[PDB]
Design a protein around this nucleic acid. Structure first.
Ligand SMILES: [Mg+2]
Ligand SMILES: [Mg+2]
Ligand SMILES: [Mg+2]
Ligand SMILES: [Mg+2]
Ligand SMILES: [Mg+2]
Ligand SMILES: [Mg+2]
Ligand SMILES: [Mg+2]
Ligand SMILES: [Mg+2]
Ligand SMILES: [Mg+2]
Ligand SMILES: [Mg+2]
Ligand SMILES: [Mg+2]
Ligand SMILES: [Mg+2]
Ligand SMILES: [Mg+2]
Ligand SMILES: [Mg+2]
Ligand SMILES: [Mg+2]
Ligand SMILES: [Mg+2]
Ligand SMILES: [Mg+2]
Ligand SMILES: [Mg+2]
Ligand SMILES: [Mg+2]
Ligand SMILES: [Mg+2]
Ligand SMILES: [Mg+2]
Ligand SMILES: [Mg+2]
Ligand SMILES: [Mg+2]
Ligand SMILES: [Mg+2]
Ligand SMILES: [Mg+2]
Ligand SMILES: [Mg+2]
Ligand SMILES: [Mg+2]
Ligand SMILES: [Mg+2]
Ligand SMILES: [Mg+2]
Ligand SMILES: [Mg+2]
Ligand SMILES: [Mg+2]
Ligand SMILES: [Mg+2]
Ligand SMILES: [Mg+2]
Ligand SMILES: [Mg+2]
Ligand SMILES: [Mg+2]
Ligand SMILES: [Mg+2]
Ligand SMILES: [Mg+2]
Ligand SMILES: [Mg+2]
Ligand SMILES: [Mg+2]
Ligand SMILES: [Mg+2]
Ligand SMILES: [Mg+2]
Ligand SMILES: [Mg+2]
Ligand SMILES: [Mg+2]
Ligand SMILES: [Mg+2]
Ligand SMILES: [Mg+2]
Lengths: 80, 154, 122, 205, 129
RNA sequence: ACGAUGUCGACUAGCCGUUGGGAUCGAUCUUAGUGGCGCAGCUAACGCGAUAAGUCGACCGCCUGGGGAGUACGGC
RNA sequence: AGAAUAAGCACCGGCUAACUUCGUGCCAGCAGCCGCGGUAAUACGAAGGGUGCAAGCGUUAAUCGGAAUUACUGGGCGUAAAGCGCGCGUAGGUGGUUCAGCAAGUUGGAUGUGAAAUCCCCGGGCUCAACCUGGGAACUGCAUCCAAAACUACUGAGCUA
RNA sequence: AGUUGGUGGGGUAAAGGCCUACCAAGGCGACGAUCCGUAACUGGUCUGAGAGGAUGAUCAGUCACACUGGAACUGAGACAC
């Protein structure tokens, strides 16, 4: 299936665009402790239907603006 | 057993009204190359008397260790004061990769392939203490089997 | 140090500084003598050591030692200097290579006459 | 290069036989091998452990006549292999072509065996070899060229080898001056006085 | 504040075995019960029991053989500050095989021998010799 | 600004005082403090020793030869 | 055809293998560090005599090692350098016990990739070696599937230490 | 402040603030933005028991430059050794 990422929406001020934060756990090369890193992605939300704090998923497409190449596929769960 | 190796000779001095009084300290080890070994130290006015006293001390309190044919049983680490010592068994072609006092103790003790190293202070007396602590406490199999049969533990 | 303390900032090596700042990574350098003279050593030893002030092509002005019993250096002599610290003298951090450009080596030298640039007796 | 000059001075310094002459008469009644060379010969001269390792290494090197760079190359390549590199060194150093010519009886001393090899007089398998380092394979048939097959030097070396013991791991047909090397000698086949692990300890520092 | 209770188990056993006691009792847990079962099956302790009544108590009796204790060195490897995991071929060998390394795998808690035979890795809980 | 000894939790022989307070039959037990000794263990040694500097776990602060120097410059 | 055409460099108090004499007299000088030299200097400069390397031998510059002396493997903080003057608390780190689920870490396997050379193993060809070269191993990583469920994470329901 | 996003249009072999006119005020940053100094990168090389540390000569892959600063033309391909 299509490779998909999951994250939390941290900004929706832009029109038809959201910002999604994605966590990851990376092992230290030398000290061997898993440390927590984050990534920020700009995602194309055509219907402007995503509020802040939601848990959503996104997939890679062709660029639609500069530094914007991911489009969301569904809302896994909505922040209350 | 009788295989004598002299580890250290040192000159020490006390003070009295009038000046200094000098003495000599000798540290030696004695064994047979078949497992038994001991160490001794001696003070005297001149070197030969100190060496003889050290040899006589070493002949007393000579202990027995269990070894797997010129080599140790398992890698081990031991310490005395601020001296630390690490040893591990080696294959047949290896010599005795050890320094100073450790080499003497192991040559006399009958091992031949030991690949040893030491950390911290390298005072010969404390290093020999640490090496005897390490060798004395080796267990050998069918003795760690003090619980059950052999080859079910291994 | 706890693992978290090392993760936040790891252990660092402080790079050691060279004891021959002149002659940057060069085994030896060419210079010209500006003043040859004699100086006295520190307290335990006692002699009259022969040294020369040298201006180098790097532009540094340093002080070098002149080894061997005799020498023919003068002011405006062009010399080759290598590294090497002289314990007895304060500030002398270099040596003058004998028999290289204008130092001519030592004479009546029979034992180890390669450190002092002496030809074989032949 | 090679060591040149007094071939008994090494024996006097080392303190043992160190076969370096024909062995016709003796060693003691040539050079009084009981004092180290020089003015100071009667000194007790206790020498530290490093001295012991150095003497043992120099002793084997002078026995087989190998310079330092080549000796360390042999040591490294023997350390590469498996099975007690300490005796691998002896196994390999015992397979040199000049040494094999020595132990077949063709030369009284290693120096003249090397002279014979370097002067194009030995065919390993019908092919001429003129270098004193060719590691002889197990099962080779060392021979002497026909032109030099009738020299008096080889004959003299033959009866000199006649009383030297028998190595028994090579076999020589003396009538036609042919030789065959079956296999590298085992550790017990060599002299049981040299302790090779001491050298291994030396290079491991 | 009871950040790591298996280390508390091991330390209790070590201290009481160092004080020539014969019974060690502590609060119980399923992981502790599994480790104690491994210890008994390997022969380093004589027996263990588990109590009842809502706050169960785990009890262990110790072995001495000679005048020395049997467990002469036990140590905690995967603490909650490092969480060591190992593959099959990298499972640590204690004292050249004369000791044991307790490993938690998807097939249960076993020794390094059993995991090496079963060809499965896991988390290295503690080492015993 | 000192116990020249970070905070939190769990285990490990004992004896003798004292402060606030409970239970059992003046004594015994028990609880939170505050002191003097002391077995194991630890330490280079002095010494610490249930108020650990012993055996462990969680997190934090700091050290890397002596002067120059906790000083100069910059910031606050 | 004819032994004919072809040995030098450093060092010798200790570390560090190898020692005696002659000349100097805190001078001339040596030195990597301890240090040596002021009338018997194995430390200076020469001799004999040795010791180590060898068509090379020493010095200089630079890197790692030894250095567990930045200590993940693998150190410390009462008195040697080192516990903030003392609280509260944000981000972060860590988390008592039982049941079930999940499948992110975790573990095992498969597939794609990780250029060739290089390093490594077994061969082969140069008279051997250096050198050239065939096959394997290795590249400890990443992505995609399949399987497992003890531990950590996440979800739900509990319990009282 | 073409700065982040959107709409109509232009432009490119091709997605795209690549360009433009309007619309909203967005976007990045103690998980180190911005600035300063230094530096081609990798397979690899030297060390080390290993973990690591230093480094990027020869050989091979990629990048950039061609007296200095700009610009385009021809062409399948250049902003051209
Ligand atoms: Mg658009
Ligand atoms: Mg773009
Ligand atoms: Mg030290
Ligand atoms: Mg220097
Ligand atoms: Mg050569
Ligand atoms: Mg006060
Ligand atoms: Mg303070
Ligand atoms: Mg404390
Ligand atoms: Mg406490
Ligand atoms: Mg006390
Ligand atoms: Mg302490
Ligand atoms: Mg400083
Ligand atoms: Mg100030
Ligand atoms: Mg002040
Ligand atoms: Mg100020
Ligand atoms: Mg000596
Ligand atoms: Mg000198
Ligand atoms: Mg004299
Ligand atoms: Mg001299
Ligand atoms: Mg250097
Ligand atoms: Mg260094
Ligand atoms: Mg290091
Ligand atoms: Mg550590
Ligand atoms: Mg320290
Ligand atoms: Mg305080
Ligand atoms: Mg504060
Ligand atoms: Mg609080
Ligand atoms: Mg707080
Ligand atoms: Mg919190
Ligand atoms: Mg949490
Ligand atoms: Mg569960
Ligand atoms: Mg896997
Ligand atoms: Mg490759
Ligand atoms: Mg499942
Ligand atoms: Mg605009
Ligand atoms: Mg547009
Ligand atoms: Mg540059
Ligand atoms: Mg190392
Ligand atoms: Mg670089
Ligand atoms: Mg170039
Ligand atoms: Mg290239
Ligand atoms: Mg030019
Ligand atoms: Mg231009
Ligand atoms: Mg065109
Ligand atoms: Mg171009």
């Amino acid at each position: 299936t299509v490779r998909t990422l999951t994250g939390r929406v941290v900004s929706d001020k832009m029109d038809k665009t959201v910002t999604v934060l994605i966590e990851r756990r990376v092992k230290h090369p030398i000290y061997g402790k898993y440390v927590k890193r984050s990534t920020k992605l700009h995602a194309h939300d055509e219907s402007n239907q995503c509020r802040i704090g939601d848990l959503v998923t996104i997939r890679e497409t062709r660029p639609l603006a500069k530094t914007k190449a991911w489009t969301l596929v569904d809302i896994v769960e909505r922040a209350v | 057993g009788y295989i004598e190796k002299l580890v250290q000779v040192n000159r020490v001095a006390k003070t009295v009204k009038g000046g200094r009084i000098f003495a000599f300290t000798a540290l030696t080890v004695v064994g047979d190359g078949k497992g038994r070994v001991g160490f001794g130290r001696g003070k005297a006015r001149e070197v030969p008397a100190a060496i003889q006293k050290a040899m006589e001390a070493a002949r007393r309190n000579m202990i027995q260790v269990d070894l797997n044919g010129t080599t140790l049983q398992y890698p081990t680490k031991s310490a005395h004061g601020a001296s630390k010592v690490y040893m591990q068994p080696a294959s047949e072609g290896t010599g005795i990769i050890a320094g100073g006092a450790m080499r003497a103790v192991l040559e006399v003790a009958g091992v031949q392939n030991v690949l040893a190293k030491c950390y911290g202070s390298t005072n010969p007396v404390n290093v020999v203490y640490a090496t005897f602590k390490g060798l004395k406490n080796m267990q050998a199999p069918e003795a760690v089997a003090a619980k059950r049969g052999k080859s079910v533990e291994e | 140090a706890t693992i978290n303390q090392l993760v936040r900032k790891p252990r660092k090596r402080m790079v050691d500084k060279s004891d021959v700042p002149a002659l940057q990574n060069c085994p030896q350098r060419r210079g010209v003598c500006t003043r040859v003279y004699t100086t006295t050593p520190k307290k335990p030893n006692s002699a009259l050591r022969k040294v020369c002030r040298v201006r180098l092509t790097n532009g540094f002005e340093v002080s070098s030692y002149i080894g061997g019993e005799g020498h023919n250096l003068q002011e405006h002599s062009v010399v080759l200097i290598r590294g090497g610290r002289v314990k007895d003298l304060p500030g002398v951090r270099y040596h003058t290579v004998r028999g290289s450009l204008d130092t001519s080596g030592v004479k009546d030298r029979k034992q180890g006459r390669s450190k002092y640039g002496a030809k074989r007796p032949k | 290069a090679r060591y040149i000059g007094p071939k008994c001075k090494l024996s006097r310094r080392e303190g043992t036989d160190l076969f370096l002459k024909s062995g016709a008469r003796a060693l003691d009644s040539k050079c009084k091998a009981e004092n180290v060379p020089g003015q100071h010969g009667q000194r007790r001269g206790r020498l530290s452990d490093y001295g012991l390792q150095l003497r043992e290494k120099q002793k084997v090197r002078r026995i087989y006549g190998v310079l330092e760079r080549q000796f360390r190359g042999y040591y490294q390549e023997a350390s590469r292999r498996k099975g007690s590199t300490g005796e691998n060194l002896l196994q390999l150093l015992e397979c040199r072509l000049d040494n094999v010519v020595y132990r077949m009886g063709f030369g009284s001393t290693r120096s003249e065996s090397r002279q014979l090899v370097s002067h194009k007089a030995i065919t390993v398998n019908g092919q001429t070899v003129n270098i004193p380092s060719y590691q002889v394979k197990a099962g080779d048939v060392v021979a002497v060229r026909e032109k030099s097959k009738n020299q008096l030097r080889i004959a003299q070396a033959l009866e000199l080898c006649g009383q030297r013991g028998r190595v028994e791991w090579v076999e020589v047909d003396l009538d036609k001056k042919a030789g065959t090397f079956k296999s590298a000698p085992a550790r017990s086949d060599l002299s049981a006085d040299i302790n090779e692990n001491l050298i291994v300890e030396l290079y491991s520092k | 504040s009871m950040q790591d209770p298996l280390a508390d188990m091991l330390t209790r056993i070590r201290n009481a075995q160092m004080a020539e006691k014969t019974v060690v009792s502590m609060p119980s847990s399923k992981l502790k019960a599994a480790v104690a079962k491994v210890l008994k099956d390997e022969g380093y302790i004589a027996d263990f029991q588990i109590s009842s009544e809502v706050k169960p108590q785990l009890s262990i009796e110790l072995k001495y053989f000679e005048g020395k204790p049997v467990i002469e060195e036990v140590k905690r490897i995967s603490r909650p500050g490092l969480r060591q995991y190992k593959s099959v071929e990298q499972l640590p060998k204690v004292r050249g095989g004369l000791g044991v390394s307790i490993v938690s795998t998807n097939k249960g808690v076993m020794t390094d021998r059993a995991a090496r035979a079963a060809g499965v890795g896991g988390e290295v809980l503690c080492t015993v010799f």
